[PDB]
Design a protein around this ligand. Structure first.
Ligand code: HEM
Ligand code: HEM
Ligand SMILES: Cc1cc(N)nc(CCc2cc(CC[C@H]3CCN3C)cc(F)c2F)c1
Ligand SMILES: Cc1cc(N)nc(CCc2cc(CC[C@H]3CCN3C)cc(F)c2F)c1
Ligand SMILES: C[C@H](O)[C@H](O)[C@H]1CNc2nc(N)[nH]c(=O)c2N1
Ligand SMILES: C[C@H](O)[C@H](O)[C@H]1CNc2nc(N)[nH]c(=O)c2N1
Ligand SMILES: [Zn+2]
Lengths: 417, 416
């Protein structure tokens, strides 16, 4: 069975056969669309039993040996058998290096909500599965941050810590991202710093962090190994590459005191590969401009600098029909890209990223038979219809390997004391 | 199963019980979401209705109607059920009381999951044109609609409902997609004069009689089809076509681009379904959201595509995409559209205002109706999406009835 997606700006039509290889559920039915629910309880992560694990292993191994053109080979049959007996005997199994690398690359490739997937094949996979302590985690993560940053010439990387066993010895990075600024709620109700991070900051402060209480404080890493209580580590500042935000025509923009970090590194998701759950798998790439300029600085629940940017642009801020928000938002985004480019720190505007994804997606349909894509997440958060993805019909379905959400660990962690 | 939707900017959570009543289908499954397909088969509606599937459709519609008027299971309810029941068993169709027609259309709008302007859904002005029999009559009704809805700029919502389908042979259809659209002409050198979305239509009109002015904003003629015959051309009296010249409140050169848009958005090619009956000609109208003209009409590549020249006149660095010159120009074009309409006292809403209105409307539907079907892919404006509150608003999309549905473009179907 085939399916069809059309681009309503170019009249290009692609044919999807890959959705037939889909297993996990969307959340939709024939009578409801959950297409815009943030986390459909299906997209989050309950430790596996041998009952369901071997078909998940087998399915993965088949995909793997297909990709290396060894499907039904002796190496393939023996590997099934090997994983077979290891599951019966130990109730889990271990991935080879080569399998883990394929796994992480394909988890990215299957991330339907990710616009930057054109680069998926060049992921740098750091195997941290020998790690046993939080200190060891801090060391692997520092090496990741140093390698990925690469003095501003960013490289995609992921570091993979030991998989879950019984869900009682989980490895977790309690930060949502490796590098993120603190948020402090004042008694007067205002917020100093990133309001998105108020909750995590207070955990850190309660865990013993001595908080500078500045407006752009990098948070400490809070790291949990083998299901033990998490421990605090300060990333060395020389490792945290930052870009001060200025505007190419507005000399007063620098005086807003804004800076942002260069390295987007998601650390709170779950990497699923052949039924195995890697509960700590920080991954990084490089920023699309709007993630900082539109969301970080201009969401109401974030730094919310729109007002003071518009204030200094002298705009009519009394009636919203003056589009003063839309105007300030564009300037702020112009400034993010200018600041980052001026310092040779890798970054991509949303026009470039979306054109690339269209090309990737077409290429994916040719050589793979489809490319799962979440239109709601792929369309940039500003200037939507002037990017080619807006007019692109997209099929959203769930392939494995996959990245999944998982509950914040502080909600689910039995404390040792 | 009693679902919930969250707003990630406000933490407001709403409980949706209304989806339980959903009758039609979404195009989605558990294995694949199609929330972004432009036209799933379900959103379209030969397919005559048998006497069978017609009475259930009527009963469900009549039941909610009598529920709405606090007379569920009452004398007149059962009688009306019985009455319509008998007319179907005999005529193989049935006719809607004026009040049911009005409730039917207001609710087709209330249920339109892709429409952000639904807060005004109950103030719809319904024009019963079911006595119409010819294209000239259709023309008369549409002229009356247009004048009533324009109201010297003080736009009022309206729908005009032509006779329902019978056997699909006697179809009323407005061949225009909107009652008022600018013309679109090819070129010897391959480019496009005017509006490229209307090039095939502007060609049909000429290839059927219309003598085109071949200007940049020529109002297209109405092409009306009654009872299934050849469609006829009619020129809307220009004095009924309220237009707004587009100037900017900061840039004197903006006037020089020589842009205008019409004030009346009036969709004419959809199909209104009420208790199982299919109204294949039901032109309806309201008032624009700014971005529909400025973002889509002006700046879409396959449309007027004026960003090139606007940015040139702004002296922006059009060398690299990373200057965001398209974005900068896009915001000014949309400031100009709003300023021009407002200055001319023609009704218009900006996308910040209308999305905020839609949040309150969601609030109200969840509080009094238990839900409000909504298509996030169409509710979020095509610019500045994430600084509008609908961006952070989860929405559940389901298909209620009565509804507006797409239908095939008549010039493929019509036995000419
Ligand atoms: C290299 C440049 C990259 C760019 C420009 C990029 C861009 C984006 C953007 C804009 C989003 C939407 C999320 C949001 O805006 O809130 C996203 C989502 C996502 N990205 Fe990418 N990304 C990149 C690399 C990567 C890498 C290396 C991985 C993993 C190996 C990855 C995995 C994901 C996943 C799993 C999501 C889904 C998040 C969710 O479901 O909430 N991306 N990406
Ligand atoms: C009064 C002000 C109104 C505003 C501001 C408004 C706004 C919109 C917008 C922005 C869209 C998205 C489609 C697009 O961007 O091209 C839309 C779709 C739609 N509107 Fe509303 N509208 C209004 C009145 C009405 C009325 C009076 C009706 C019918 C009685 C209606 C029915 C619809 C329908 C059915 C759709 C979606 C078509 C589909 O399902 O694909 N609207 N509207
Ligand atoms: C590697 C990488 C590259 C680039 N460019 N951007 C990012 C951040 C996007 C990103 C964001 C999230 C969570 C955001 C959602 C959850 C709450 N909030 C609304 C989860 C990811 F997995 C991810 F990728 C990451
Ligand atoms: C009454 C009214 C008020 C305002 N403001 N805007 C509109 C236009 C929106 C609108 C647009 C369409 C179809 C457009 C689709 C087909 C190709 N293109 C992507 C079908 C509608 F039913 C509708 F409503 C109407
Ligand atoms: C393919 C995609 O569904 C298509 O471009 C849709 C997306 N969202 C839209 N939203 C609105 N309001 N109007 C549109 O025409 C569209 N087009
Ligand atoms: C409610 C809705 O699901 C939520 O706001 C989503 C919409 N699309 C998004 N798209 C991106 N890229 N990032 C986001 O955080 C979101 N948030
Ligand atoms: Zn769906």
């Amino acid at each position: 069975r085939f399916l069809k997606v059309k681009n309503w700006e170019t009249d290009v039509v692609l044919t999807d056969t890959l959705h037939l290889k889909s297993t996990l559920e969307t959340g939709c039915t024939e009578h409801i669309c959950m297409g815009s629910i943030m986390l459909p309880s299906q997209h989050t992560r309950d430790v596996r039993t041998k009952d369901q694990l071997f078909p998940l292993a087998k399915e993965f191994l088949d995909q793997y040996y297909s990709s290396i053109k060894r499907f039904g080979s002796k190496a393939h049959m023996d590997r099934l058998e090997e994983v077979n007996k290891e599951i019966e005997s130990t109730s889990t199994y271990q991935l080879k290096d080569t399998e883990l690398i394929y796994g992480a690359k394909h988890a990215w490739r299957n991330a339907s909500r990710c616009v930057g997937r054109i680069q998926w094949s060049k992921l740098q996979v750091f195997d941290a599965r020998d790690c046993t302590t939080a200190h060891g985690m801090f060391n692997y993560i520092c090496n990741h941050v140093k390698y990925a940053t690469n003095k501003g010439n960013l490289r995609s990387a992921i570091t993979i810590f030991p998989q879950r066993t019984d869900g009682k010895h989980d490895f977790r990075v309690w930060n949502s991202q490796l590098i993120r600024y603190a948020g402090y709620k004042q008694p007067d109700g205002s917020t100093l710093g990133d309001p998105a991070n108020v909750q995590f900051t207070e955990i850190c402060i309660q865990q013993g962090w001595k908080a500078p209480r500045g407006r752009f404080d990098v948070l400490p890493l809070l790291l949990q190994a083998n299901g033990n209580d998490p421990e605090l580590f300060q990333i060395p500042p020389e490792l945290v590459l930052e870009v001060p935000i200025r505007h190419p025509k507005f000399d007063w923009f620098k005086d807003l005191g804004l800076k942002w970090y260069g390295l987007p590194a998601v650390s709170n998701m779950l990497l699923e590969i052949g039924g195995l759950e890697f509960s700590a798998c920080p991954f990084s790439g490089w920023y699309m401009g709007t993630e900082i300029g539109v969301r970080d600085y201009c969401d109401n629940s974030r730094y919310n600098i729109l007002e003071e940017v518009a204030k200094k642009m002298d705009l009519d801020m009394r009636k919203t029909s003056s589009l003063w928000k839309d105007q300030a938002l564009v300037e702020i985004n112009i400034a993010v890209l200018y600041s980052f480019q001026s310092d040779k720190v890798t970054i991509v505007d949303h026009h470039s990223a979306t054109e690339s994804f269209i090309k990737h997606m077409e290429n994916e349909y040719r050589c793979r038979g489809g490319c799962p894509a979440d239109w709601v997440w792929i369309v940039p958060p500003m200037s939507g219809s002037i990017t080619p993805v807006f007019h692109q019909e997209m099929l959203n379905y769930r392939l494995t390997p996959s990245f999944e959400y998982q509950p914040d660990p502080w909600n689910t962690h039995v404390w040792k004391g």
